[PDB]
Amino acid sequence: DAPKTFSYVYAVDPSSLDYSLTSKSSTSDVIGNVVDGLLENDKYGNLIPSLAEDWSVSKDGLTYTYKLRKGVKWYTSEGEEYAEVKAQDFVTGLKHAADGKSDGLSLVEKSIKGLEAYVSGETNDFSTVGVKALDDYTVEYTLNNPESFWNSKVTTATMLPVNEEFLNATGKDYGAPTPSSILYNGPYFLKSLISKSVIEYEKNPNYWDKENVKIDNVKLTFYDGSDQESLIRSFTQGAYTTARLFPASSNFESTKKEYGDKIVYSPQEATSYYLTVNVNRQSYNKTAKTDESQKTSTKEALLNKNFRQALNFAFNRHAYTAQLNGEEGADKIIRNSLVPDNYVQVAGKTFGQLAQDELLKYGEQWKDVTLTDGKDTIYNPTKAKSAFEKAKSELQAKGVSFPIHLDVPVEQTDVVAVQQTNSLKQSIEETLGTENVIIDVLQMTDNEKESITSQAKVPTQKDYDLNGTGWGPDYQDPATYLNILDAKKGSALKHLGITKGKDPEVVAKVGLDEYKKLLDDAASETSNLDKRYEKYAKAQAWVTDSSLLIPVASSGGSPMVSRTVPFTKAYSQVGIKGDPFIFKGMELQNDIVTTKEYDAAFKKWQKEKLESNAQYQKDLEKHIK
Amino acid sequence: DAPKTFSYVYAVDPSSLDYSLTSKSSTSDVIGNVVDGLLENDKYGNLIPSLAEDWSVSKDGLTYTYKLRKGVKWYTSEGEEYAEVKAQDFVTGLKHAADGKSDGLSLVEKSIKGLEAYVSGETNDFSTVGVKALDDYTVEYTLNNPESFWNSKVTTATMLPVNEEFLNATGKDYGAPTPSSILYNGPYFLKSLISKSVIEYEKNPNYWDKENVKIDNVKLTFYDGSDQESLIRSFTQGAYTTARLFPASSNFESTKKEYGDKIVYSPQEATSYYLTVNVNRQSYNKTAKTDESQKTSTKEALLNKNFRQALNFAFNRHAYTAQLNGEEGADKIIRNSLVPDNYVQVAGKTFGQLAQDELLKYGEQWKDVTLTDGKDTIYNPTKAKSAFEKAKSELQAKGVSFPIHLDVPVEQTDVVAVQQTNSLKQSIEETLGTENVIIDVLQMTDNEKESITSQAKVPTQKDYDLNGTGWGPDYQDPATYLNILDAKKGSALKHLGITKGKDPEVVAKVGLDEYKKLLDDAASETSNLDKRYEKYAKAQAWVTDSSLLIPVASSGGSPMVSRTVPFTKAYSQVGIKGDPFIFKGMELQNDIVTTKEYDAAFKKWQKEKLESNAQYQKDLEKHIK
């Protein structure tokens, strides 16, 4: 349901309940809950009607008139009806503040006409002061000067109403620090006021605005400041509704990890996911195209490198991976390469660092593109439109018809895959415009999607224009990734519609023959790791530029909570000795690992892993004999 | 202490424990914990010694030789010593993989010399294959070609050792999915393997590297994927050490708030804290200056506006408020003005918006300075050095001697105040250089700090050059702040060493007479709120430029946790009806408010409060009669 009791603390006892005579907040903090004035504040600070249901100010700004609500009663400490709140109770309160030498008078002493002369003593009768009860329900204030901020003063303790009969009947005991010494017309009764112990309010069931009083009981235990941690301790046990924390105390950091974020996203792993562009499709059993003019224009468009690059630059990876992971986890799985950035290294430089240095040769469009993990560096609508206009003119000189239709199958029963593909259609069509490119998302069963993609071994059966797939490593060398596009044995050629031994026509068109020379020149380096990894980085740059394997994401990046000490476990990306279920070296702890501790441990591990692998590689020389 | 049991899940049963014959990960995930090979991985991925205590490769890269550790034993399922691990066990394992038609052979089939011919069947004797036991503790591999990634292959299941006696003795039952079907030499014993139920490992107490095995017991309950939420549920009950979360499930968001950050910093409040520059000091009972030449040069320096602006631009507020609040709470209390940004508004434009528009008249140094809350916009070391060089030349033409010494008292027993003042000395001296300015932090008792600042009513007793103090509002008008510098009645003049009715000399030097004309012109507007608040914004711009009241911070910004529904409570900055202990309108809830929910509620409240106050101000017209 919803709680109706509020429990917290207070720090200063009220020495007096006479709100007319003192405005120290140790009194007002009680009185503001139990005694109402002319106006209130809403949740936005606006001065809204309280005991005055309406108010007006004269044209000259000197006269303020308040129309009171009629059915409002004063109530005793015991809850018994005393009398009806009348306009004269506002003359009484202000007259009591003057006669009683109140400390809260300087806000209105020189504003209310004739009041300053009455407090100084040069008049002895209150009739001259600019507060009048024109009738039982009309309070009128007259000021010396116009005050645009006057209404902000009517919510002070000095300006509250006081019943004259009760004031004189109780006499010297009026305003004593006990609940029986004042009368109540506000949202709450003061049920208990025990010095250096407790303050208790209970909702007044006859309050005129009882429906806005949503907390029925309020209890404030006395807090001396001797134990700053009693509050967060009581809150954790459920005794307090709220708890102030103190950043300077010796215990703040422990409090921070107990109530801080604990969800962490595992580091990205070695499997790389990408989209395969079918540049040699001869199966159209599942297409949205109608003409052969559309099939032809699509086939020529996909063979154009500028057109594949325009698709690449137009694809919003964050929106695509926000559908599978979180919005907070969307960047945690993005990969802009095929070989992971740090899969190997030479002289402290990661493979992605090497591959990026070879990438700008292919054109200015690769400026600022880093072949890294964690953030989409490829998506660029400006670059995508610039790439497409170049493709548009090349194709338009070949009788190509626009828009280009692109079939992308997806399993209808896979909600995330549908949402992801719909986002792919969205980002590309938004960037390139639907008069240019149309992504035809074809939803279908598990098996027909599978029958035209993953179990369509024969390339001539691959029935799509774009499809998502992945690849993971088998040995600690870039070739385990980069060999999948090998013109004669590459396993990824069937996903592009290319058979391993045929199609020299298509292989030459997409440039896979130039890639083949890059593969063999890199493979020839059997000993020199520097030359070897430099030459494979040239191959990765070709893949990035080719846009045949439009990168999407990696494995890993899954959210989790854990009491495992992170980055103590043995680590590997090939073999079995660093797999996820390897427990040698792993440490456990009693407390949940917080997100901040995990991210600080990850950055330190990243820094140490770089140094360790580099020192290890230098030490490979000592194992020669 | 530290837990020694790991509890989680597994999803695929091992169909076989014969690691030589299959490399499916449903087998390797078990075997990697219980059977060791030549090399391991450390926590960084490096291939480190395992059963081979050292290894070498020939100059041509074709021959790899591994020196085994001697005291390693094979152990039964029961924990009984079987035999000592010898080099021949690596010939046996690879020969078993060939004879048994293993699926994990394609990694090394064409690398190990003569192996491919043996698996194809054109040789029938294993003596031709490039794996040899040169003695009981020397394994030698011969490759067809050099492979810089070869060692990454020796941690695969296919490459693990196998005892020949046990292999032939157990026969057809070898590798069955039961723990008695293999032998153990790795970190763990396989204690239980019940299909679709449990996998249990126990630490092997005789393991050669037992000190790196820090988890004693591992239990993996079978997880079928039928209930994705069983994992986070079991983790919350303490049954699992870790738990994967699934961002697509209907329950992820609830999981996120249960394990997400819950600490929130209350919004900044109306009290403004600032540093008062003593421009008229005639009490030197607590100073670090020695000469009169230093007192004179300091007195003239503080009267220079460029010098006060250089101090202002040089003061790092984030570092100062990182000592009182958190490092995560440091910006949560910063204020760059005297009047709060949104204290009043005209036509949807906040007072800080008005004041900023009047600020750039005073010079280019106020470019990009916003008079807002939340982020230090004043601190600028470039602007501080540019301001000081202008001050340097003006003062150097008046016989002023550098560095300028500035006394700043602080209560020694107040740790935070000491740390804060030391950071003030740090940031200013780092920016301006210690040959130019020196901030002399004078630590002292509670009372002497109090005796020369807050209870030194007479201005001639103010014994400092800079001191921190604050001021809060009494009515909803900018004048409640801006009147404190009034030349004849302003309460803040004594903090600058200026008496309310005297010192026309000093008042004219710092320009407080020009400020006085700004105050009266603004005060003259009794009705037009637009002209009134525009003219007070001109006064605030003068204060910002004067740098007599160098702004520091606000009240509020305190960290807390709460079950209160935020921004339902009545709100006010003057009066008593919106004070912190006002409970009318406040709502409670059962769950702890998370930081994300509180910050989304704050931004929405900020947006609504702006619209509500503006609609309210337009509606003030209907109350005229």
Numbering used by the authors:
A (entry chain A), B (entry chain A): 31 to 655
Paper text:
Given the auxotrophic nature of pneumococci for certain amino acids, the Ami ABC transporter system, orchestrating oligopeptide uptake, becomes indispensable in host compartments lacking amino acids. The system comprises five exposed Oligopeptide Binding Proteins (OBPs) and four proteins building the ABC transporter channel. Crucially, SBPs determine the specificity of their respective transport systems, thereby governing the range of molecules capable of entering the cell. The five lipoproteins exhibit pairwise sequence identity of ~52–60% and share a very similar overall folding.
AliC was also crystallized in the open conformation, and its structure manifests all the characteristics delineated for AliD. In this configuration, the Lobe 1 (comprising Domain I and II) of one monomer becomes intertwined with the Lobe 2 (Domain III) of the adjacent monomer, resulting in an overall architecture that is identical for the two functional monomeric units. The resulting entwined dimer adopts an open conformation, but the width of the ligand-binding cleft is expanded compared to that observed in AliD, measuring 29 Å instead of 16 Å. The observed domain swapping in AliC would be compatible with its insertion into the membrane, given that both N-terminal ends would be oriented toward the same side. Nevertheless, to date, there is no supporting evidence indicating that a domain-swapped dimer represents a functional state of these SBPs, including AliC. The domain swap in AliC results in an extended interface area of 5173.1 Å2 [calculated with PDBe PISA v1.52], occurring at a hinge axis passing through the middle of the loop connecting α7 with β14 (residues 290–294), extending between Lobe 1 and Lobe 2. This loop in AliC contains a glycine residue (G290) that is unique compared to other homologs, which typically have a lysine residue at that position (K287 in AliD). For instance, AliD presents a significant number of aromatic residues decorating the binding-site cavity, promoting the binding oligopeptides with a high hydrophobic residue content. Both AliB and AliC share strongly acidic pockets P3 and P4 but AliC features distinctive basic pockets P1 and P2.
